[PDB]
A paper describes a structure:
The diffraction data collected at 2.8 Å resolution on [name]-1* crystals grown in the trigonal [name] space group (two molecules per asymmetric unit) were also refined, yielding Rfactor and Rfree values of 26.9% and 31.9%, respectively, with ideal stereochemical parameters. Superposition of 158 Cα atoms of the two independent molecules, in the trigonal crystal form, yielded a rmsd of 0.53 Å. Comparison of the [name]-1* structures from the tetragonal and trigonal crystal forms yielded rmsd of 0.53 Å and 0.42 Å, for 158 Cα atoms, depending on the chains superposed. The only backbone differences observed in the two crystal forms are located at the N- and C-terminal residues of the polypeptide chain (residues 2 and 159, respectively), and at residues 124-126 of the GH hinge. The crystallographic dimer is identical to the quaternary assembly found in the trigonal crystal form, where two crystallographically independent [name]-1* chains fill the asymmetric unit. The rmsd calculated over the whole dimer in the two crystal forms is 0.50 Å. The dimerization interface observed for the [name]-1 dimer is tightly packed, the stability of the assembly being granted by several hydrophobic interactions, hydrogen bonds (also mediated by water molecules and, in the trigonal crystal form, also by sulphate ions) and salt bridges.
Author numbering:
A (entry chain A), B (entry chain B): 2 to 159
Write the structure that this text describes.
Amino acid sequence: SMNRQEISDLCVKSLEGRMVGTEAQNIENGNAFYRYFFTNFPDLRVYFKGAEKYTADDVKKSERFDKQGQRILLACHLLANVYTNEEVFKGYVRETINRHRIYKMDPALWMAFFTVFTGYLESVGSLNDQQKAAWMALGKEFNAESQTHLKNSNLPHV
Amino acid sequence: SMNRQEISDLCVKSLEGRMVGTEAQNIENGNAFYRYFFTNFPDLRVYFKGAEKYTADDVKKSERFDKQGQRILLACHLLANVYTNEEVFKGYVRETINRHRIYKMDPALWMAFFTVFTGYLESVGSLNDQQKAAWMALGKEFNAESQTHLKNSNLPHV
Ligand code: HEM
Ligand code: HEM
C-alpha cells in the first residue's frame, strides 16, 4: 500500500497534537518524551552522561531535558515533513547519525527509537495501526540508510 | 501575491540542481557554495576560524568544507521543504539561532544570508525572479523569527 507520500501525511498527523514551540504546553510535549523514555526504557539512560539514573521527576524539572526534549520533538517533525523528498530525508538521517557517533550508540537502537516514540505518542494522545506502521516504514527507511552510512563511515553497524 | 505552498515549490525546484548526497558531484554542491561565499563576501571569512584567509583552492582541497558544505546545503533544503508547516519551520529557525550562539554574529546577517544563497544559485545555474523572490519571502520569515527569538533570549537583535 504505502508510498513515500502517504507515509508522511500519516506520520505528520500523529504529531499535530504534539507541536513544538516556546510556550508551556509546547515545552511539555518535549519534556514528556524523556519522562516516558526514561521511565519505560531506563537502561538506555547510559548514553545520557550524568542523567544515567534520572527519575521521572528529575527530568520533569530539568532544563537540560527541556532543551533536549524540544530538540528531539523538532527532529521527529522534521522526519515526518521531509520524508516525501527522499535524498534530503537520507541526508538529514546521515547528519543525525554523525551528531550521535560521539555517544557511540548500540547500532540497533536506530530501529528501537520508534518503539519508544510510537509508545510515547500512544501514551500522550492518540495513535493507530496505520500511523504506527508509517512510523515503522519511516524507521525501516531511517535504519536502512542509518546502516548504509554506518558501514560507509567505517563504524559499528548491523 | 505568493503563499506558503507557492514558496515551498519554487524554493525546492531551484535546489534539484544542487542536491545533497555522498557522490563526488553532491559533495561539491556544498563546497562550491563556500568557494562562492569566500570569493564574493570576504569580510565574512572572519567567522570561519583558521579559514579567515582561505581561497577557492583552499576550500576545494579542504575536507572540512566538504563536511561543512553538505550541512549548510542540507539546512537550506530542509528550510525549503518544511516551509508549508510554519511551526516546524519556526522551530528549526530557533534551533538554527541556538546553534549559532557561540559565533556571536551581527544579528543583521540572518536576512543577509539569503542574498548570498540566491547569489550562489545564480552562479551555479538557473534561478528566475519568481524563485528568487520566493527565497526572499522565505528569508523575511526566517529573519522575523530570528530577531524575535534573540529578543526573548536576552541576546542582541536588530
Ligand atoms: C533511540 C536511540 C537514541 C539514543 C540512545 C539517543 C541518545 C542521545 C543522547 C544521549 C543525546 C545527548 C543528550 C545530552 O547529553 O544532553 C542525544 C541528542 C540528540 N538526539 Fe538522540 N538518541 C536516540 C535517537 C535519536 C533519533 C532517532 C533522533 C532523530 C529523530 C535523535 C535526535 C537527537 C537530536 C536532534 C539531539 C541533540 C541535537 C543534535 O545533536 O543535533 N535521537 N541523543
Ligand atoms: C552569513 C550568515 C551566516 C554565517 C556568517 C554563519 C556562520 C557559520 C559558522 C561560523 C559555522 C561554524 C562551522 C565551522 O566552523 O566549520 C556555521 C555552521 C552552520 N550553519 Fe551557519 N552562518 C550563517 C547563516 C546560517 C543560516 C541562515 C543557516 C540556516 C540554514 C545556517 C546553518 C548552519 C548549520 C546547519 C551549520 C552546521 C553546524 C551546526 O549545525 O551547528 N547558517 N555557520
